Amino acid sequence: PTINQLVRKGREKVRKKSKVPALKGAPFRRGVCTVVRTVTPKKPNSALRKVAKVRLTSGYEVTAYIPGEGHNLQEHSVVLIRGGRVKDLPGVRYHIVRGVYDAAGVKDRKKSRSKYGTKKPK
Amino acid sequence: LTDPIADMLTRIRNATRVYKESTDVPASRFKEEILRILAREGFIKGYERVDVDGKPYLRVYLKYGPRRQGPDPRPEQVIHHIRRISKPGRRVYVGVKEIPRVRRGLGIAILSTSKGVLTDREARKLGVGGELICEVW
Amino acid sequence: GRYIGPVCRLCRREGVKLYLKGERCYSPKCAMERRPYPPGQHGQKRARRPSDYAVRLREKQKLRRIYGISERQFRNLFEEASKKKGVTGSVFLGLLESRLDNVVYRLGFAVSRRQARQLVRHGHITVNGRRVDLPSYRVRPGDEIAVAEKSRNLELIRQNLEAMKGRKVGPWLSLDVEGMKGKFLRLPDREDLALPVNEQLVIEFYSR
Amino acid sequence: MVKIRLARFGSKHNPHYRIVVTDARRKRDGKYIEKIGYYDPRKTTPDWLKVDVERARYWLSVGAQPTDTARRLLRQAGVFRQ
Amino acid sequence: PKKVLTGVVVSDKMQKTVTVLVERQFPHPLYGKVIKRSKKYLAHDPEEKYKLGDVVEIIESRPISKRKRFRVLRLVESGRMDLVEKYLIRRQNYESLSK
Amino acid sequence: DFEEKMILIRRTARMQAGGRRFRFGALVVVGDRQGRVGLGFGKAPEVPLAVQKAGYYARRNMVEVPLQNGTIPHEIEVEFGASKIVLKPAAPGTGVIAGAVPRAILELAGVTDILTKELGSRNPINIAYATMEALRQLRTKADVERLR
RNA sequence: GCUAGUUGGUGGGGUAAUGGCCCACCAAGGCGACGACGGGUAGCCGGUCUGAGAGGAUGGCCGGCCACAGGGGCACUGAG
RNA sequence: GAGGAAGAAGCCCUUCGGGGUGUAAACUCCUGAACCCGGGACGAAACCCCCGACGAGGGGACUGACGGUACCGGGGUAAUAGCGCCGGCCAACUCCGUGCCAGCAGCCGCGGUAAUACGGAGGGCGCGAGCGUUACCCGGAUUCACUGGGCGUAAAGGGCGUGUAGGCGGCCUGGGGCGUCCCAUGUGAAAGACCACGGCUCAACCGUGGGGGAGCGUGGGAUACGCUCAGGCUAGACGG
RNA sequence: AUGCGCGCUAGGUCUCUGGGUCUCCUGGGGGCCGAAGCUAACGCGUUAAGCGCGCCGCCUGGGGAGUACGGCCGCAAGGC
Numbered sequence A: 001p002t003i004n005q006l007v008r009k010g011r012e013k014v015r016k017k018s019k020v021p022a023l024k025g026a027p028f029r030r031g032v033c034t035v036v037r038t039v040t041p042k043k044p045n046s047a048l049r050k051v052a053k054v055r056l057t058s059g060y061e062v063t064a065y066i067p068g069e070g071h072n073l074q075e076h077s078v079v080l081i082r083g084g085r086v087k088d089l090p091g092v093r094y095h096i097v098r099g100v101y102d103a104a105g106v107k108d109r110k111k112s113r114s115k116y117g118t119k120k121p122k
Numbered sequence B: 001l002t003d004p005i006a007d008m009l010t011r012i013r014n015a016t017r018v019y020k021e022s023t024d025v026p027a028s029r030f031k032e033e034i035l036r037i038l039a040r041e042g043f044i045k046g047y048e049r050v051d052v053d054g055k056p057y058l059r060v061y062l063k064y065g066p067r068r069q070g071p072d073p074r075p076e077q078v079i080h081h082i083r084r085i086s087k088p089g090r091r092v093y094v095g096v097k098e099i100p101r102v103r104r105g106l107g108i109a110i111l112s113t114s115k116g117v118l119t120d121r122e123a124r125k126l127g128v129g130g131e132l133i134c135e136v137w
Numbered sequence C: 001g002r003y004i005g006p007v008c009r010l011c012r013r014e015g016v017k018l019y020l021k022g023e024r025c026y027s028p029k030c031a032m033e034r035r036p037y038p039p040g041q042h043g044q045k046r047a048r049r050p051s052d053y054a055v056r057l058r059e060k061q062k063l064r065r066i067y068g069i070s071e072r073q074f075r076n077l078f079e080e081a082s083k084k085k086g087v088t089g090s091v092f093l094g095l096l097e098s099r100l101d102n103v104v105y106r107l108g109f110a111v112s113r114r115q116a117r118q119l120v121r122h123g124h125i126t127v128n129g130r131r132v133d134l135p136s137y138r139v140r141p142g143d144e145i146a147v148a149e150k151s152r153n154l155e156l157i158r159q160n161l162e163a164m165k166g167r168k169v170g171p172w173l174s175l176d177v178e179g180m181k182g183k184f185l186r187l188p189d190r191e192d193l194a195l196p197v198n199e200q201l202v203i204e205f206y207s208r
Numbered sequence D: 001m002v003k004i005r006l007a008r009f010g011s012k013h014n015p016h017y018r019i020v021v022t023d024a025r026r027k028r029d030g031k032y033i034e035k036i037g038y039y040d041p042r043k044t045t046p047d048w049l050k051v052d053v054e055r056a057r058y059w060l061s062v063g064a065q066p067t068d069t070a071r072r073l074l075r076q077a078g079v080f081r082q
Numbered sequence E: 001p002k003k004v005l006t007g008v009v010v011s012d013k014m015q016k017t018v019t020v021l022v023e024r025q026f027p028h029p030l031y032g033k034v035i036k037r038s039k040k041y042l043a044h045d046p047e048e049k050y051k052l053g054d055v056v057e058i059i060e061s062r063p064i065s066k067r068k069r070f071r072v073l074r075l076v077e078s079g080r081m082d083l084v085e086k087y088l089i090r091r092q093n094y095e096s097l098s099k
Numbered sequence F: 001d002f003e004e005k006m007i008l009i010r011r012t013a014r015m016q017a018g019g020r021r022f023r024f025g026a027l028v029v030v031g032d033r034q035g036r037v038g039l040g041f042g043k044a045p046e047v048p049l050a051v052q053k054a055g056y057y058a059r060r061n062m063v064e065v066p067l068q069n070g071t072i073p074h075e076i077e078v079e080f081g082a083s084k085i086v087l088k089p090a091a092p093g094t095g096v097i098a099g100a101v102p103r104a105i106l107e108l109a110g111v112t113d114i115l116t117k118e119l120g121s122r123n124p125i126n127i128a129y130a131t132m133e134a135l136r137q138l139r140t141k142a143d144v145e146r147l148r
Numbered sequence G: 001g002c003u004a005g006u007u008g009g010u011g012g013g014g015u016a017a018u019g020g021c022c023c024a025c026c027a028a029g030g031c032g033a034c035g036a037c038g039g040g041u042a043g044c045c046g047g048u049c050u051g052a053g054a055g056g057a058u059g060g061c062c063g064g065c066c067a068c069a070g071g072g073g074c075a076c077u078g079a080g
Numbered sequence H: 001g002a003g004g005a006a007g008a009a010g011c012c013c014u015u016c017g018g019g020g021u022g023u024a025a026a027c028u029c030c031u032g033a034a035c036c037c038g039g040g041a042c043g044a045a046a047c048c049c050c051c052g053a054c055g056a057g058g059g060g061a062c063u064g065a066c067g068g069u070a071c072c073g074g075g076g077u078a079a080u081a082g083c084g085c086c087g088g089c090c091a092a093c094u095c096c097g098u099g100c101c102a103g104c105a106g107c108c109g110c111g112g113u114a115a116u117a118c119g120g121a122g123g124g125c126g127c128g129a130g131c132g133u134u135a136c137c138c139g140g141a142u143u144c145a146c147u148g149g150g151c152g153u154a155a156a157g158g159g160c161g162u163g164u165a166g167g168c169g170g171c172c173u174g175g176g177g178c179g180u181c182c183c184a185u186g187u188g189a190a191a192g193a194c195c196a197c198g199g200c201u202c203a204a205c206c207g208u209g210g211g212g213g214a215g216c217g218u219g220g221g222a223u224a225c226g227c228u229c230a231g232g233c234u235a236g237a238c239g240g
Numbered sequence I: 001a002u003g004c005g006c007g008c009u010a011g012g013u014c015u016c017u018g019g020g021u022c023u024c025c026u027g028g029g030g031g032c033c034g035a036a037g038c039u040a041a042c043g044c045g046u047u048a049a050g051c052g053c054g055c056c057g058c059c060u061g062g063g064g065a066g067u068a069c070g071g072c073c074g075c076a077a078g079g080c
């Protein structure tokens, strides 16, 4: 653009839409599990994704992902969520931290144990 | 027409590329000093005031490298680069502590000053700034 | 804190007989002697072509593990070394050779930089009279370092001087066996240093 | 009244003071008016007290009011040795 | 020092007050171009003698009115209505930018 | 001799009846660390053939570069198609600061203190050509002084 | 498009003091695409982080300024 | 900490040969984190009193929460390591379990029977009393391109003229000296940043001093450039 | 699928329209091939997509969608 254009208009600095609206804008945001169910991810993958829909303390009620293998989750489970969307799931843009308020650590876990909220073996 | 100086610059650059012996420009006391600089800086074979149709011109005698062995025999351009800096669109003025070290010294940076047209080597020699015309190498 | 595990394997991992124990550094029981290849299950296997990062990574891991310094303190010194003028490599080196224990080991009072920390960290040395126990201490030029007089009666330090009865010291230093003392003369130069390292690589490792 | 007093710089258990002409009602570490000398209460450094005699002599002349712990040092700096 | 400006009489419909268009050049803070930003000041003409299209010098002063803090330091030039016209054009064009 | 690096080794594939038949291309750089550099780009039906072939082109496509205390007499920027490269001399303590491709190149010229930046397309082949071309344009002070 | 104490003038009241600050009256002015007014957003700054730099984000502690002191209004005393 | 096997055991892999774990260990010597004892502050010299003289100045004494703390001496034990990752990016690889399920994932994508991509083990790698994740800023992003981008076909030339504001503008010569530059100069607080040195046994931290430092005010100078004004020219433009 | 104005940068050729001193040169348009150069390529190339300058418009992944909303215009379709 001509300098006179950049003076008349100037470069339009671009903002970024926050990918995690529900946190808003806290790092973590506790919520209660309402619909603890499964989901089949889109192609190409094929599985039974354990997905829960939780209502946030921020008023929202969104579906988050449940990591690990198996879970004590159910409806009316106090849970802290976080994180980014699982790609292969549709719009499941939050995780469920294993190790917070209902998310018992994945039993028998041995690797990545800080993730998944497991205590070290004796 | 907007800026004769860039024209005389580009008239050089165009003339440089097609390896003209010399070229001409509608003369002007300002340009004449710039041409003096390049000749004084070995950037040209020199110039001379000439008329064409009652309009004074400047036969800028370009200087070229030697003919180069290999695929391209074309001699290496003495003026590898010529680019007006302060433009009619955006003027540019340099303090003493911002007259750039063009090309680590191999290049130059002619720049108008209240003390007249000068090179960046001169300006730091005299510690003066001004409107910065063009970097050259 | 400092590295505390097995130390031979770092040479086997680095593939170079870095000196980390003293005697077994020079024994035929040097781990580089017997098994001059990386440790672990895949050790002997055909070494793959190292990447640029891996090479430069190995460099810093080479140099850093020479001194046992934390990655942080190694990194901290670099910026300080980086902020200073001149060849950042040699400048960054002299600081590394300016550490208290390093000056101690380089002065020959310990058969290993690791052991030298124990002398420092247990207050067995005084810096210009002041009994300093900061292993990360920086010894400036023209400084006097000697065994604590109470540490003078210690036999290990004798054993070290037993070795330095005829062994020499780098040109930036000056030693007295019988006085149990040493003087840091000048900044160790890059040429003076026998570090098996291309620190130029180590520079770029922090240029990323 | 524009006073002369020692503001605490340094850190925990390492007092460093600036004998400084300043308006009274300022906070003791706020914007002073003229740093007219530092002070090592702990005397760790050889020149642990360096104060410009004349400026205090100036500010005193113009209406300064040094606190006792300050005037203890100006006399100790000998600004009053007339 | 009291601030001193030089602009053109662009309005004198107010009693004892004239509107002086002050034009000031300056480089753009980012794009380096020297740009011209004008401005209107309601200098106090106690005599109402400076007339329209008259290049004058106004000066900082104690506040005469809510909108006035300048007096005409002195005349600089008259008959500069051409400048005034360009102003009048500007405010005139504002009618063409409605909806 | 000369020192040599396998900068890039890609496999291209032309389709036809029966399917895709592959060919290996290789960027191979060859220098002495003393100003001499050769950008070999050999391609052939197999890695060792192309690499061996690629270095052969490099040895004939050598170019000596005017080092100065481990750096270059001046910064430079070459537009090679979309690859826009920018190189820049630095103090002796600086080192080489480049992407892997040109860093591999300049580390064989003998350059050891150089500030660079790849702009535009970062195609490693095109990057390399701009680098070898930029080295082909460097000039010492005396050279230009001879020209003028 | 905004603006009728709205712009200005005169006189007056109030003020430590200029001031439409307020008041009475007279005039119709003033503001705006150089973005008025409207909405949203926000304490501001030295600085901090980031960056090659330009620049971008940021203004937690600390230092200076401002506003507030359950939300609003109001004055009294007082140098304040 | 040193020495310490051609290398215990266990475990894991295995080509069954052995290899890795690994001088790692145990083991011997050496020190002494802790801890025990004792001593133990700087920070505190003032205000005050006397003398002087109710001054300069001199003399006297008082006061410490921190804290019996730091710290010092003596004695003194071999005394915590975890976390993440290991397809590529990117550093570090095998076995077993599973078999598009379970699961992982930031992207590429891995998983449908031998998965270096999931879970476990061994190994290894990076950090280390930290190690990761998430949130958000900057960078990378030259991906708002002033530095430092583009528009025939990738996104982008407006349908086109006219022209308003605005932007920009030929030659020469003068004048003003506005931008412009330069000088001096005040300011540009402190703290922060930088530099030098210094004290904290180093560092962090802090102190001191130096430097700066965009910007603005102030006065002076210069006129090349742009600006302004004035006078001329015809190469642009218009006209005949 | 190429905003405008201006300047410079091989040429050959065809074509239309003027002037001349009619081999040819000088001009103004319209095509073709092509130097240098540019271009991701395709191709552009004195009728630039080259080299420059001034000015304006415009782009910031695809779709969602030139849709929603609002506003203006329009009889309406609908347009911006």
Ligand code: SF4
Residues within 6 Å of the ligand: C007, C008, C009, C011, C012, C016, C017, C018, C019, C020, C021, C022, C024, C025, C026, C029, C030, C031, C032
């Ligand atoms: S040399 Fe011998 S002792 Fe020193 S490290 Fe290598 S193996 Fe361990």
